Amino acid sequence: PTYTPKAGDTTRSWYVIDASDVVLGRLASAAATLLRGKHKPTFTPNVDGGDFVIVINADKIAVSGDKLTKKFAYRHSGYPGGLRKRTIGELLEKHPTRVVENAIIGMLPHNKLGRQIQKKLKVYAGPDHPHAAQQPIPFEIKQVAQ
Amino acid sequence: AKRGRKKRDRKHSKANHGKRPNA
């Protein structure tokens, strides 16, 4: 019948994605794609069998239009009147990384498996990362023509 | 009248074709 992975069937690859002058939504959508494992013919929605993704230069992300001043990130502290908002602007120089990862978390499934999947994401604001030991192969944001 | 307007207007979706119960 239909193939389902056994215990030692999942193999993990390390991708590094450069984020310099890339659209935030495009980068995050692709990273979510190859973080969930949608690019593998052995995909199965039950199993967490994606790949590791490093995002490099999360500072240099591109946000189009006029969202660096009028787009907000809202958090609520649970206390009455405990809502705070930070623009994309402030969030890009206070601590930038979460901006990129915020987008990716919004495109992974919001279940327990999504929590397991998140752990494979490594966002770095700098141009360099500490994971050179896993030989991360560079990944290009490609579109397949039709 | 926000609730009424905003319920009454979601009939104009593409999948509802300008109609919906209770208008």
Added chain:
Amino acid sequence: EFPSATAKARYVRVSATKARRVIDLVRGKSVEEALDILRWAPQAASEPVAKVIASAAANAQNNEGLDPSTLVVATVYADEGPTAKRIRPRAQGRAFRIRKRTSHITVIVESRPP
């Protein structure tokens, strides 16, 4: 398996859940350790259970004829028994029910190797 001796105490005037609360102290222990623990434990339900344990030990003394010091309280539990129902009169003509509960304490001890 190990050689075993049994002792049962039925219709003891102690709630089963109040007997278990001191039975859980001594399960799977040497007989002498269990008897000490029961003798210094400050809950009244120790009086029945202790006796039951001792009774079982005596059976291995006198019917299996096996060594006192190798005994371990392998299995011990407390089953419910018959309940008597009484009435406590309350305010404004109400009458509430009271349960006088009982228990059956069962012990099997084994003569395990040292």
Added chain:
Amino acid sequence: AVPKRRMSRANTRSRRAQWKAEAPGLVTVSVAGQQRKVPRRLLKAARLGLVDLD
């Protein structure tokens, strides 16, 4: 107030679990040349013969 629903077995057994006893910590004493076990609280009183070791 009055319980709205009958409470479930998992939730009943969850706090019936807290109603337990702890075994006293015993130490050894020597009375009449033979060894007995007594709480460390009653150690002295056993050592000068004021607790009845049955």
Added chain:
Amino acid sequence: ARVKRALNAQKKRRTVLKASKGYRGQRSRLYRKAKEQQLHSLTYAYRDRRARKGEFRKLWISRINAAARANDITYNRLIQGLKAAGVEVDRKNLAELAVSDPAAFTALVDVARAALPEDVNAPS
């Protein structure tokens, strides 16, 4: 002629209770709550028996799309070309090809691309 209705009454009770094993709570202990659960269980079994054929087609399509895009072709163009070529393998076995041996999948993608219009956006 008085009957004691207990021989007949217990039969369906045993049936439903034996069917309700594994149910968490009192849905595996009490005949009434177990019967209420059995109603939902058999309706859900009907519903999911019908939708299993769609869930598995979804899974096969997802696997085929991933393998096709590895072969640098879109899923929709791939199956359009396979329809044009007359190769008439279903998505189930097309997914077994995608997983088990990718060389035959590559060859089949080659056939699908060879049997496809020189302009897929042409007005024809």
Added chain:
Amino acid sequence: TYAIVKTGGKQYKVAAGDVVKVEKLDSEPGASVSLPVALVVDGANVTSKADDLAKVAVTAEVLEHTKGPKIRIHKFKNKTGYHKRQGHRQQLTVLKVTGI
């Protein structure tokens, strides 16, 4: 090599010796049926053209006739009093494929 047989409105991947539970076929057990093919893979080359796929058939032998799993249906709609019980067992044949 391995083929993909068509039978019972369904397609099954098959290699010599594989046993497959297909829909009911009119053949007493022991008899050999011949089934059409939707694809053949021999080593690294596949047969996908329609005419020469029609040139090859898969020959299998019927081992037995089987009943599928017992399916129990209890249609029910709440507050209307409507119940409807029934059951279904599907009839099947077990095929031991011999040649392709």
Added chain:
RNA sequence: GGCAGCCAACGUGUUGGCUGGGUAGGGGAGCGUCCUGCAUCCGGUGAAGCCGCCGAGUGAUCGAGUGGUGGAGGGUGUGG
């Protein structure tokens, strides 16, 4: 691929064609319980009841298939 309702054809059991969501409600055909006429069969070499295992039927349900427990009565056919 399996079932069923209405109808048709040869013909006298098949095949074929159409049809088979459903409350109030109407009609048809059945499952299980007990008591009994008549007929048969089983049972201290272990009946019923209960607890299981392994199965079965389109449904109510079945198990003159099997074990454990049990200790004196039961099954089936055809009518009431």
Added chain:
RNA sequence: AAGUCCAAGAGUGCGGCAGUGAGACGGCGGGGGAUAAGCUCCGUGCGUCGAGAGGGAAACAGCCCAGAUCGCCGGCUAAG
């Protein structure tokens, strides 16, 4: 005059047994109201819900698609 016509499971008459006689929203034509109401009252070989499962509308009786005999780890589509 034809069509459907191994069906609409259609008309009409007689009889046995009924349930129903609180309807809802949406489209079109209108009265009452302020050309208000998820208001109220009528018309409609109009629809759906009632008595309707499945797909779409985020969720969402009455809107759009489509009427569930059962099974399948086949294919083509509808609204979207």
Added chain:
RNA sequence: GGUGAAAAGUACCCCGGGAGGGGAGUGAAAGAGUACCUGAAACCGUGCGCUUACAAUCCGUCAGAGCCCUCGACGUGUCGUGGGGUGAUGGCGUGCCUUUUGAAGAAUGAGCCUGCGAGUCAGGGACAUGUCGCGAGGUUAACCCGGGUGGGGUAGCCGC
């Protein structure tokens, strides 16, 4: 209400203040011990197997990794037309009944189990429809004779 065929109702020994038990005996059986035939469910434990402490669960259903048990084969651990148990995880998923235009409804009812609890009967009643007997006829009521369910009984009644 129910020990057993019969009290043969547990001598004696041991733990315990007794209650209760453990040996030994009685008995076909003590899974029959004067709390006694069978001994279901609710409810309550103990032992083992799998699982569960970053997780928003009408508590199921469909897919499903891992572990555990079992049946075959080849062989000596890995498949198989397999079968069970438990289930990380993923999709879908608003209890039952009453009564309502419409209730998962925050409308009613229901703590749980076991036993019980609702279209029955009388009548030469009425109407209709099956079935049977006799048929331009059909049939008796009270009653009388029969240890019976059988036989007589023309008064009437319905058709004409």
